[PDB]
Amino acid sequence: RMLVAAGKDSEAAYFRSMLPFHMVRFARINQIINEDLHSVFSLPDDMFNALLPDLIAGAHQNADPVVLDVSWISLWFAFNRSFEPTHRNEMLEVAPLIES
Amino acid sequence: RMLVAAGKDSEAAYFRSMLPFHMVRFARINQIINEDLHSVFSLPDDMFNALLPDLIAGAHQNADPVVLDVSWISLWFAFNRSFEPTHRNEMLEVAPLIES
Amino acid sequence: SGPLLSVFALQEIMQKVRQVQA
Amino acid sequence: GPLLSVFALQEIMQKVRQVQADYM
Amino acid sequence: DSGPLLSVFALQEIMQKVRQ
Amino acid sequence: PLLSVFALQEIMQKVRQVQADYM
Amino acid sequence: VFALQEIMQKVRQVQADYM
Amino acid sequence: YIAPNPRISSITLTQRITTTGPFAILTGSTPTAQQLNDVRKIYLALMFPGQIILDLKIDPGERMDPAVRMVAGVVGHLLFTAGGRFTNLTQNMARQLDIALNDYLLYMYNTRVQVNYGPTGEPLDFQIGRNQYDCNVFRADFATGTGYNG
Amino acid sequence: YIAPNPRISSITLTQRITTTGPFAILTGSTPTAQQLNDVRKIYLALMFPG
Amino acid sequence: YIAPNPRISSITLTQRITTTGPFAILTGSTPTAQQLNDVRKIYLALMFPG
Amino acid sequence: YIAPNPRISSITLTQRITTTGPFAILTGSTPTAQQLNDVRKIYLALMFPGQIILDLKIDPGERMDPAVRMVAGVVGHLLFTAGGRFTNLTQNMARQLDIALNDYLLYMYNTRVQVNYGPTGEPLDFQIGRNQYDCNVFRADFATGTGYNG
Amino acid sequence: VAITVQGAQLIKRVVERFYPGIAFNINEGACYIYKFSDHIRRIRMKHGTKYRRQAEEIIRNISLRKERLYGIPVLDEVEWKYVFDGQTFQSYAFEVYVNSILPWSELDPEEEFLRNYRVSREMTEVEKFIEFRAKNEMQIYGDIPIKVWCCFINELSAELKHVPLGMQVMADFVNRFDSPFHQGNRDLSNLEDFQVAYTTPLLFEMCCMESILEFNIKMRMREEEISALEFGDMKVDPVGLLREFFILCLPHPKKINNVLRAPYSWFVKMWGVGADPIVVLQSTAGDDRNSKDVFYDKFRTEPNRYKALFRSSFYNESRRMNEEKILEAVKYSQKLGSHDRRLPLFEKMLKTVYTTPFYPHKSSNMILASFLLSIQTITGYGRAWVKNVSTEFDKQLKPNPSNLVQDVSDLTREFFKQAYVEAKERREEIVKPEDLYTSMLRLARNTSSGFSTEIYVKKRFGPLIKINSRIKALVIFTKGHTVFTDEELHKKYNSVELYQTKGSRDVPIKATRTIYSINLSVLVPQLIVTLPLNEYFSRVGGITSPDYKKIGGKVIVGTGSRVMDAADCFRNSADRDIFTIAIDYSEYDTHLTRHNFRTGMLQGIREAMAPYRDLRYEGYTLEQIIDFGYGEGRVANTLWNGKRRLFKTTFDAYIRLDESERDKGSFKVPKGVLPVSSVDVANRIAVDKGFDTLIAATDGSDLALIDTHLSGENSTLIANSMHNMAIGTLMQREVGREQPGVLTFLSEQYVGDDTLFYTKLHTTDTKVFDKVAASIFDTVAKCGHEASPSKTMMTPYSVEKTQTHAKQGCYVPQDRMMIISSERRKDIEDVQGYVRSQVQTMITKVSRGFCHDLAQLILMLKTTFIGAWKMKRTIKEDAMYRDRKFDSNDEDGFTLIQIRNPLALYVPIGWNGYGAHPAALNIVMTEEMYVDSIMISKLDEIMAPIRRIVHDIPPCWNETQGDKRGLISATKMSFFSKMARPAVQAALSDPQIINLVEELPLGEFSPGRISRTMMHSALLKESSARTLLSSGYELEYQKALNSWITQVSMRLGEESGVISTSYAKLFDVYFEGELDGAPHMFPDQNLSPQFYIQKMMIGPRVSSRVRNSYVDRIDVILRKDVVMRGFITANTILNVIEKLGTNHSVGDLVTVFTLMNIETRVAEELAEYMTSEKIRFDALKLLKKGIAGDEFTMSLNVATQDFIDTYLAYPYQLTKTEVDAISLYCTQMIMLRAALGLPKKKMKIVVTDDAKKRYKIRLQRFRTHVPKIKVLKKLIDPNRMTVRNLENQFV
Structure with missing residues (x-):
């Protein structure tokens, strides 16, 4: 709606046609974080919620994220x-025996 | 705001994308006038203020500027x-000994 | 010499070799 | 040698772009 | 002082006036 | 096909009279 | 016709202009 | 890594000749070795959301290339999550993606597209279009994520 | 003297081809050795203002 | 007889291809040896008005 | 002597996804015959606190990056000591280690942060950043030792 | 009177001097005669097939000239007596040479330059060795036999009423001894006879060049209308300078001329400086000292700020040492040839060299400064000997803490890390293991153009024909796979069973430099780490200043012309405040032998590729393959070939030790030397004064080991300059600390084996300048190397940079290019394309100070018999050409001779002639140009002999491909399977994909056909095609002669794709309006008046060159790709983009390019450039026929964007390719308009308004754009914009 208000016609006509392709890459990513990458080495919930406020406030008592x-x-x-x-x-099926 | 109202579109979207390059020209020039061309051979303030009214009024009781x-x-x-x-x-580092 | 008939339609008239023979 | 249109050229280009991605 | 250089189409016009 | 200029130019009295009439 | 001596006269004027 | 159709862009982005732009030039231009290795860093930070964030390089000339900067300003507002409950952007990258977008919305506009500016002067501070669409939304705000994917 | 990016005179000024103008001709048209000396007179009179 | 600059008609009258009118044909098209004589009659009546 | 661990400034994730250090060109350098004796001049001025003090050695024979000087003001402000009890450096090098820091904080290659200068003209006299840290405390003052250790 | 008239009258007198009586008319296009042969008859006489007595009957009647075969007259050439038997002459030059005759009993067997040894009847086997040495030294092969060269000088000297001394001593030699050598006319390398000295061909080359250089300067003095050459106040004639120098360089030419070269070049380079009023040529450019955008101004005379500096200890020692180099040279000639002449003319000149001025604004002073640089080429090419001397590493400089040797190494090492970083920032790194085998042939081929190497191979070919090694770049299509293996990499070349061989090739004046031919087991590991240094430094755009830290702008390696490429010398020599210090290293490469360079370079590239440690090439790490290329014992012990060191003994010492200690078989013994088994018994009994025999060792001195930075390496020109920058920047350090404040350095630049700084000298005092100059020479001596004070110059108003001389803001030129001899025996298998290059060579010669009227006459001398004698067949009197049958009356006295007309140099190309114009050399004549040149009314007196012979030219030679002796199945496809692009390799994985891609317009470049065209492209070379199809073309050339018609026609346009410059005859061209009347200024004086008046009324090039056609724009951007540009051209890529129709998307264009084996990194710019130029693209190409490829034309203002606006006026409705043919017609016509003295007018294309002659233009533009033969094959699209636009615009 913004790109069509500014008159960018043939650039908002391209993000409309790419939309049935953009919405499947965020199910291919969603099927990876929820299913493949669910191990004991993942971040717990009481640390994952405290990552966005710790980046805004500038505190550093917890581990920083990796910056690429x-x-x-x-x-x-x-x-x-x-x-x-x-x-x-x-090593996905062997993965519980390595952690235990 | 005049070129976009006169109808010149492409000749006004050219100047908007030359604007960060237009500022780095006068950044390097303001480095040169302020902190590089600073000698006793710089014009004093009580003669620099009278260069524009002598050009307007046409009085030639002072030193004329150099026309290129x-x-x-x-x-x-x-x-x-x-x-x-x-x-x-x-000759910058030797200049205060040359003027003295 | 007729532009949009001598370089356009004589391709289309001579497209008979495309559909009938193959 | 006859001239080829857009659809006769991009459909023969879609196949060869796939086999270049299979070699990687 | 040098004259204008003619084209081929004027040079094919003078070559036929001596025959026709 | 195309056109071609000839080799023999005995018109070199006429064409010098043609271009001098222009000037 | 063309004379190779008139071409030098426009050169000997400029070489004398350098002097 | 699977690309889209070639007809997903030729019918809409280069759909008429005799008018170029920042999106038409970036079509074509296949990636090199490093510029595809940077795509490997994009998709790694999208799988571990809060633990791996990414920032932009300080290369010369490419930031002074306006065609690269404008098309990478619009794309980053549809691809990365900045705000809500996590982030994939640094505080500094999500500001650079806004001045890229500010240089694209008022890139080439005639007097038909009415642009009333704002009294703050910072990027994305204008009501644009005939319907007067507010563009202060798409400025980055990490407390709630007003512009990006979340 | 450095020149800007050539895409700044390609994606906005000569972008609508099959139409020329005053600005579109002046893109390209590389300067002579005499006119590049005249740019040195411009940037000399900007450093000494008055 | 002095012609104008070639850039007068190059940025106004033939500024775009794929458009022809009554003016865009006549640019270029230098006169023949008899039509240039008629320009001598134009500039004789302009000097002697009545 | 002992160099730091090479895994401090670099983290490897998979094979090609590696983390880049900020001072990568200064870590990949080596001292010459002359610049190694000056390291022994520094460590002979730290073991004897008040007895051996330092200066700048202005010579035009060397030819370095300007970024070497600007990073040598940040390191010198947290390695030496100009406190209220002794000093490792002369009253001249305390001045020349501030103009090195004054040019480092103002040379911004990312998006610029705002800066309010003060009324005077001394170096390190501004309030840099969003939260407006007072940068006046990092100017040298040999009666209290405000910029350096102590 | 004219040029074409009096030129042909002299050439007709040459052929009637070269032959006794021949009715050679002007109006005939060619004359055909027969020559007598007896050797091929005597072979037939051995087989016994005879009818008539051949020997005595034919030879007597030929001398009586009555008999003739088939109506065509048969005669022989004139003898060597009658060339100069028209007059007798005695001269002191011949008395010196007969006094310099040395017998056999004085010679040194391995001198680097030959002396004058006497031939003797019943010669011994050591005089046979001198006959072996003379046949290998003074090979004077070239264009024209040396006999008819002497008939040309004898004919010319009678007309100009002057007798050159080279003609004088030859006439003094002829009447005493008749014929020095019997040279063949078919090939120019064979000669067997040798009169009183072996050096008679090198004498006759030196005598002809002394005759040409005198005919140059006496004619040039007539052109500038002066009678003498002025030197300050006094006047000297330059004929006296040559005559005193020719006598001096007579008794040993190749050693005396080599040592006089350094005082001659130094004398001119210190002439003008130091005089109290100094005239310069004012010029201004960019603030960098290496700015090339120079524009020029008037002359002015300033006071000299350095008028007192030249009475120092430096300049007085430099002139005193240069006098000794003359005095050691002339005293050597006093002893050899017994003459007591002391060269008094030149020594009076050099005694006051710092004081007497040199002013360029006079013609007389500019001529003499260019004359003394052109006097060096008097001895022809330098064929020499080099003895294979080892490193002798027991005398090179140890790294001491006193000297600065170890600081050279760490600063060499740092500069390699800096270059790999700056190339990494410019996306150039080493090639990855994925792309190793695919970039191997890319870099081995294009560096073979740089530095060619060798590996022995059996090149086999079948339809039974065997080809030898044939050392070229296609060797790696045979054994490309097994050179990079385990056992081929682990061999070291210090053993006797394996070594490498040096190869020798001569130079124009200097000593003969040898090229090392290294193996591929040491090159392809060295080639992979050299790659980002080679492509990065070829980017010539850079800024040079010591306070700037970027290595890419300072060092230059290697648009066409040298005036626009070296304009920095013309600007900096004009400034009164620039004091350049330019040093040179005598014996440079022998001081690269020290460990300061090689150990410093090797640890540089080790630490540079240490981030690339993990990646491996077939299991080999980077540390392993950096040792396979360089080696700690590879180059430290490499046995190199060459001639072996040979001793001289007596035969009594040989007969008692012959069967005991002499072997044969290991290494090859020369022709007149006896062998010996070892070298220990050779030097043991070695000394003798009679030297009745010569011995040579075969297995004692196996070979000669050297540790020297070889010229055969891939890293030669780069690593010579990094070490040159490292020695330069220490010189910056020590001078700044020893004398601070004096001699600041504004810019620096480094090429291999030279160094140049543009410094601002501060203090003018002699007592403190020698403290600076001694500190320079002590710093370069502390760096291991050696500098010479007699060659290193530090002077304000004189700048020289890589054989480009400039003085006081003007150009002092030199033409050391030879015209007689070459570096390989010249084959003329393409004669029409040969003298096209010979015309473009003499254009560069006349622009460098040669005479216009003399260089015209040399080219009219060539064009009669460049390609005459290469015949094997006999013709009929009824205008019929056949292959002769082996009969008794057709095999004796039967070789045809075809003397072409000397006016074939003006018949334009495409009409079997060569396109040079009689008004100027740099103008070429096309078919339309001949029509316009006869149309201009003041060329009728010049072009009158060219008009009567225009179509009478017989056709020339050519070499083409054949269906016979063509394809062989398996020579290249072994490596072609292991080498293809990853786009190409994916097509070869599936046979369905290879069927979908042959339907594309790739055509002749399909993946089943790319291998076969790649092998037919490699076989264009000499020993496989030209020596095999030499039998084929003679059977095809007879067909072209009988089918040739004498009717000719100028054709508008060309074949249906391309257009020529004859498109400009579609319209009328008028000339209206005066432009201006200002004569321009230019730094290059010493130009002929046919070349001066073009540079006067049209200025030099001040702007950048135009990007004129699409075809030259492709070859600039195809130049970044490497293999394909040598094989595919701009023509075949433009037909692919034509057969594709309208270009539809950019991503569709890049994928068809990489399918054509094009590099991915360059194909993305092609699709970006072409889809931007899509709306103006048209289906046309351009055939320029080289109207601007010469050196003088690119130095002019024409063919640029600013040229067209102020001279041309074309209608708006012309497509860009049609505009390019118009403007290329415009630059030729405005050149001819200025060379005639005609007033310069602004030409305008004229079209009237009547429809009767407008329709004929309208029909022709539709015919050129949409031809009839291209629409029947379904190629022209109706949807193209410029095809739709043409029909509406013109009517």
Whole structure:
């Protein structure tokens, strides 16, 4: 609605057609965090809620997040690549015995 | 605000994207006037204020400015070239002994 | 010499070799 | 050699872009 | 003092006036 | 096909009279 | 016709102009 | 990594010739080795949301490339979550993605698109369009995430 | 003297081809050695203002 | 007889391709040896008015 | 001597997803024959507190990055001591270690933060940032030792 | 009177001097005669097939000239006597040379330059060695036989009424001894006869070049209308300077001319400086000292700020040492040839070199400064000998804490890390393990153009024909896979069973430099780590200042012209405050042998690629492959070939030790030397004074080991300059601390084996300047290297940079390019494309100070018999050409000779002639240009002989491909399976994909056809195609001669794709309005009046070059790709983008390019450039035929954007490709308009308003854009914008 108010017609006509592709990459990501990446090494709930207020306030009593560096043109390439997990990890079924 | 009202669209969206380059030209110039061309051979304040009213009133009881002759197409090439002072001048550190 | 008939329609008239023979 | 349109060119390009992604 | 260089289409016009 | 200019130019008295009539 | 001596006369004027 | 159709852009982004723009030039231009390795860092920070955040490089010339900056300002407002309950952006990256967007909304506009500015002067402070759509929404605010995905 | 990014005179000023103007001709048209000396007179009279 | 600059008709009258009118044909098209004689009759009547 | 652990400034995640240090070019440098004796000049001025003090060695033979000077004001403000009981550096190098810090905090390569200068013209006299930290305390003062250790 | 007239009258006298009586008319296009042969008859006489007595009957009647075969007259050439038997002459030059005749009993067997040894009947086997040495030293192969060169000088000297001394001593040699050597006319390398000295061909080359250089300067003095050459106040004639120098360089030419070169070049380079009033040429450019955007101004004479500095200890020692280099040279010639002449003319000149001025604004002073630089080429090419001397590493400089040797190493090491970082910031790194085998042939091929190497191979080919090694770049299509393996990498070359071989190739003046031919087991590990240094430094755009820290702008490695590429010398020599210090290292490469360079470089690239530690090439790490390329014992012990060190003994010492201690078989013994088994018994009994035999060792001195930075390495030109920058920046440090405040450094730049700074000298005092200059020479001596004070110059108003001389803001040129000899025996298999280059060579020669009227006559001398004698067949009198049958009356006296007309240099190209214009050399003549040049009414007196012979030119030679002796299935496809792009490799994985892609317009470049075109492209070389299809073309050239018609026609346009410059005859061209009357200024004086008046009325190039056509714009951007640009052109990529129709999307264009084996990093810019230029693109190309490829044309203002606005006026309704043919017609016509003295007018394309002649233009533009033969094949799209726009615009 904003890109059509500013008259960007042939750039809001492209995000409409990409919308049935953008909504499946956030189910391919959602099927990974909820199912594959659910282990004892994941962050607990009483630390995950306290990550956004600890970044705004500038406190540092807990562990900081890892800061990675991406480029400017890499933002445009990320929008045109999905993530199809063609090979699941080779230590997923063995994973409870390693932790125990 | 005049070019967008006169109808010149492409010739006004050119100046909006030249604006961060237009500021880095006068950033490097203001470095040169303020803290590089500062000698006893700089014009005093009680003569610098009277350079504009002597040009207007036409009175020639003081030192005239030096008039240079440029061309019409030189103004467009001045807009697409800024100044980057690579080699700072080699007489700067010896200058207070030269003036003294 | 007729522009939109000699470079356009003579392609389309000579497209008979595309559909009938194959 | 005949000229080829848009649809006859992008459909033969969609297949060869897939087999280039299979080699990676 | 040098004359205007003619094209080919004027040079094919003078070459046929000596025959026709 | 196209056109071609000839080799023999005995018109070199006429064409010098043509271009001098223009000037 | 063309004379190669008139071409030098526009050169000997400029070489004398350098003097 | 699976790309979309080639007809998802040729019918709408390069849909007419004799008019270029920031989105038409970025089509084509296949990624190099490093610019695809940076896509590997984008999708790693989207799987562990709060624990891995990302920031922009300080390369010269590319930040002075306005075609790269404008199209990466609109895309980042649809891809990253900044605010709500977690974040994928730093405090500094989500501000740089706004001045990229501010340079694109009022990029090329005639007098038909009425742009009334705001009394604060900071980026994204204008009502735009004939319906007077407020654009102070899309400015980043990490307390509630007004602009980004969350 | 450094030149700006050539995309700043490509994505907005010569963007609508099949239409020229006063500005669109002046893009390109690389300066001569004499006119580049005249830019040095411009940036000399900006450092000494009055 | 002095012609104007070639950039007068190059940015107004033929500023865009894919558009032709009564003016855009006649630009260029230098006169023949007899139509230039008629310009001599125009500038003779302008000097002797009545 | 002992260098720090090489895993301090760098964290590797998978194989190519690695974390970049901020001072990467200064970590990948080596001292010459002359610049190694000056390290022994520093550690001979720390073990004897008031007996050996330091200066700047202005010579034009060297040719370094300007970022080497600007990072040497931050390190010198938390390694030496100009406190109220002894000093490791002369009253001149305390001045030259502030103009190094004054040029470091103002040279911003990211998005600029606001800065309110003061009425005077001494170095390190402003209120940098959003929360407006008073930067006047990091100017040297040999009766209380305000910028340095102690 | 004219040029074409009196030129042809002299060439007709040459052929009637070269032959006794030949009715050679002007109006005939060619003359055909027969020559007598007896060797191929005597072979037939051995087989016994005879009819008539051949020997005595034919030879007697040929001398009586009565008999002739088939109507065509048969005659022989004139003898060597009658060339100069028209007059007798005695001269002191011949008396010096016969006094310099040395017998056999004085010679040194391995001198680097040959002396004058006497030939003797019943010669011994050591005089046979000198006959072996003379046949390998003074090879004078080239364009024209040396006999008819001497007939040209003898004919010219009678006309100009001057007798050159080179003609004088040859006429003094001819009447005493008749014929020095019998040279063939078919090939130019064979010669077997040798009169009183072996050095008679090198004498005759030196005598002809002394004759040409005198005919140059006497004609040039007539052109500038002067009678003498002025030097300050006095006047000297330059003929006296050559005659005293020719006598001096007579008794040993190749050693005396080599040592006189350094005082001659130094004398001009210190002429003008130091005089009290100094005239310069004012110029201003950018604030950098390396700015190339120079514009020029008037002359002015300033006072000299350095008028007192030259009475120092530096300049007085430099002139005194340069006098000794002359005095050691002339005293060497006093002893050898018994003559007592002491060169008095030049020594009077150099005695006051710092005081007498040199003013460029006079023609007389500019001529003499260019004359003394052109006198060096008097001995021809330098063929020499080098003895294989080891490193002798027991005398090189140890790293001491006193000297600064270890600081060179750490500063060399740092500069490699800086270059790999700056290339990484410019996205150039080393090539990854995925792309190793695919970038291997890319870099081995294009650096073979840089530094060519060798590996022996059996090159096999079948339809039974065997080809030898044929050392080229296609060797790696055979054994590319097994050179990078375990056992091939682990071999070291210090053993006797394996070594590498040096290769020798000569230079124009200097000593013969040898090229190392390293193996591929040491190159391809060295090539992978060199790659980001090679492509980054070829970016010539950079800023040079010591306070700037970027290595990419300072060091330069290696638009076409040298005036616009070296304008910095013309600006900085004009400034009164620039004091350049330019040093050079005598014996540079022998001081790279020290560990300061190689150990410093090796630990630089080790730490640089340490972030790339994890990645491996087939299991090999970077540390392992950096040792396979360089080696701690590889280059530290490499046995190199060459001629072996040979001793000289007596035969009594040989006969008692022959069968005991002499072997054969290991290494090859020369022709007139006897062998010996070892070298220990060789040097033991070695000394003798009679030297009745010569011995040479084969297995004692196995080879010669060296540790030297080789020129055959891939890292040669880069690592020579990093060490040059490291020695430069220490010189910056020590001078700044020893003398602070004096001699600041404003800019620096480093090429290999030279160094140049542009410094601002501060203090003018002689007592403190020598403290500076001695500190420079002590710093370079502390750095291991050695500098010479007699070659290193520090002077304000004189700048030289890589054989480009400039003095006081003007150009002092030099033409050391030879015209007689070359570095390989010149084959003329493409004669029409050969003399096209020879015209463009003499354009560069006349722009560097040669005479216009003389260089015109040399090219008219060539164009008669460049390609005459290469015949094997006989013709009929009834205008019929056949292959002759082996009969008794057709095999004796039967070789055809075809003397072409000398006016074939003006018949334009495409009409079997060469396109040079009689008004100026740099103007070419196309088909339309001949029509316009005859149309201009003041060329009728010049082009009158060209008009009567325009179509009578017989066709030339050519080499084409053939269906016979073509394809072989398996030579290249072994490596072509292991090498393809990843876009190409995916197509070869599925046979369905290879069927979908052959339907694309790739066509001749499909993935089943790319291998076969790649092998047919490699086989264009000499020994496989040209030596095999030499039998084929002679059977095809006879067909082209009988089918050739003498009717000719100028054709508008070309074939249905391309247009020529003859498109400009579609319209009328008028000339209206005066532009201006100002003569321009330019730094290059010493130009001929046909070249001066073009540079006067049209200024130099002040702007950048235009991007004129689409075809040259592709080749600039295809240049970044490497393999394909040598194989595919801009033509075949433009037909792919034409057959694709309308370009529909950018991403569709990049994927068809990478399918055509194009690099991915360069294909993305092609699709961005072409889809921006889509709306103005049209289905046309351009055939420029090289109207601006010469050096003088690119130095002019024409063919730029600002040129078209102020000279051309074309109608708006012309497509861009049609505009390019118009403006390329415009730059030729405005050049001819200025060379005639005609007033400069602004030309305008003229079209009237009547429809009767407008329709013929309208029909032709539709015919060129949409031809009839291209629409029947369904290629032209109706949806293109410029095809739809053409129909509405013009009517």
